[PDB]
Amino acid sequence: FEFNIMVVGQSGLGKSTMVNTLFKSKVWKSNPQMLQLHSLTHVIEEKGVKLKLTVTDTPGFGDQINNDNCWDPILGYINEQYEQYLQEEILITRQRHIPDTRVHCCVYFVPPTGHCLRPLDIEFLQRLCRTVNVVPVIARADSLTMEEREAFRRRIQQNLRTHCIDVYPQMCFDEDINDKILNSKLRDRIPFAVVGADQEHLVNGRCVLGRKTKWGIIEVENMAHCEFPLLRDLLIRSHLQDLKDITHNIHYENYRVIRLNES
Ligand SMILES: Nc1nc2c(ncn2[C@@H]2O[C@H](COP(=O)(O)OP(=O)(O)O)[C@@H](O)[C@H]2O)c(=O)[nH]1
Ligand SMILES: [Mg+2]
């Protein structure tokens, strides 16, 4: 019943706002200077299904002049959870339920530059997708027009293919034809053009999360405004269990194979 998300990206990309946008979404009838990793856990529920959701907010990388090996604090934390799960699994006397602190999905925030992936993003995504499920998003997508979001999305998809970045949902995990059709529609939308908002607003008799601009409000849970519902339903509803299966059966097993061979 445990599910762990981690937001990863440069500072000023709306990551902390996105953590609050998830934890206060209207899908649920239940309302609820950083320099280290901070995990926020809330045992949420939707329609009679209890879920212990944990979202780990990360400090900003890429803000320094020298950002070489800035991925190691994140890659080190992910491997720590694999190592702790492995040590609990190899004990002679084990716990009846091993606590699952492994990251089941990483949400990587791409700056809305409108150009393409930067060398920093490529190096981070290449090493992240090797050990964890990664779903990239176009951060603060409202800073780009609808036509610019689509063109920027396509160029990123081209960068992911040229640099061999297998992003969730990985095409090598679609067995059923129904999965091949549903996931192909998702990969066409990744990276999601997301917009975050932790502020509520009264919009004609409805309470909604949104960003207040000059000529209206950007309802973040409205598909006609942004693609946050696509990211939200993937993580919480449609692909929650599949993310946990791939984390356990693929990523953790790969870590286990390496550790037991070098031992
Ligand atoms: N245009 C736009 N601005 C946003 C969005 N989300 C957050 N912001 C703004 O970005 C600023 C910093 O956001 P924050 O969540 O702290 O970014 P973080 O450093 O990655 O955690 C805030 O002033 C927010 O108002 C968004 O979806 N669109
Ligand atoms: Mg933040």
Instruction: Tell how far the Cα of 184 is from the centroid of ligand 2, in angstroms.
Output: 31
Instruction: Tell how far the Cα of 142 is from the centroid of ligand 2, in angstroms.
Output: 18
**Closest-lying ligand to the alpha carbon of 14?**
1
Instruction: Tell how far the Cα of 211 is from the centroid of ligand 1, in angstroms.
Output: 10
CA neighbor of 34 nearest in space, from 69, 54, 63? 63
Classify the C-alpha dihedral 151-136-165-117 as positive or negative.
positive
CB–CB of 98/89 below 8 Å? yes
Residues in the chain: 263
Name the strands in the sheet holding 217-219, side by side, starting at the edge strand that comes first in the sequence. 200-203, 206-212, 217-219
Q: How far is the C-alpha of 72 from the C-alpha of 170, rounded, in Å?
A: 23
Q: How far is the C-alpha of 51 from the C-alpha of 179, rounded, in Å?
A: 24
Mutate to test the pocket of ligand 1, among 17, 35, 38 (most ligand atoms within 8 A of CB): 17
Instruction: Tell how far the Cα of 227 is from the centroid of ligand 1, in angstroms.
Output: 16
The beta-carbon contacts of 143-146 under 8 Å, at least 24 apart in sequence, are: 143/112, 144/112, 144/114, 144/193
Q: Which amino acid is at 81?
A: Q
Distances, alpha carbon 49 to alpha carbons 52, 77, 119, in Å? 10, 29, 42
Residues forming a β-bridge with 105:
5
Q: Are strands 38-45 and 2-9 parallel, antiparallel or unpaired?
A: unpaired
CB 17 near ligand 1, within 6 Å: yes
Q: Resolution, rounded to a tenth of an Å?
A: 2.2
CB 140 near ligand 1, within 6 Å: yes
Distances, alpha carbon 63 to alpha carbons 10, 53, 75, 140, 163, in Å? 7, 29, 18, 18, 24
Classify the C-alpha dihedral 22-76-117-154 as positive or negative.
negative
Chain centroid to Cα 125, Å, comes to 12
The beta-carbon contacts of 245-248 under 8 Å, at least 24 apart in sequence, are: 246/133, 246/168, 246/170, 246/173, 247/102, 247/103, 247/104, 247/105, 247/132, 247/133, 248/102
Relative to the CA of 10, which ligand 1 atom is closest? 20
Q: Are strands 192-193 and 217-219 parallel, antiparallel or unpaired?
A: unpaired
CA neighbor of 40 nearest in space, from 69, 8, 7? 7
Q: Specify the CATH class of 1-263 in words.
A: alpha beta
Q: How far is the C-alpha of 139 from the C-alpha of 137, rounded, in Å?
A: 6
Token readout for 241 is: 């269990």
Number of H helices, E strands in the chain: 8, 9
Query: What's the chain's Rg over C-alpha atoms?
Result: 19
Instruction: Tell how far the Cα of 196 is from the centroid of ligand 1, in angstroms.
Output: 7
Elucidation technique:
X-ray
Query: What does the DSSP 8-state code read for residue 1?
Result: -
CB–CB of 243/235 below 8 Å? yes
Q: How far is the C-alpha of 209 from the C-alpha of 200, rounded, in Å?
A: 5
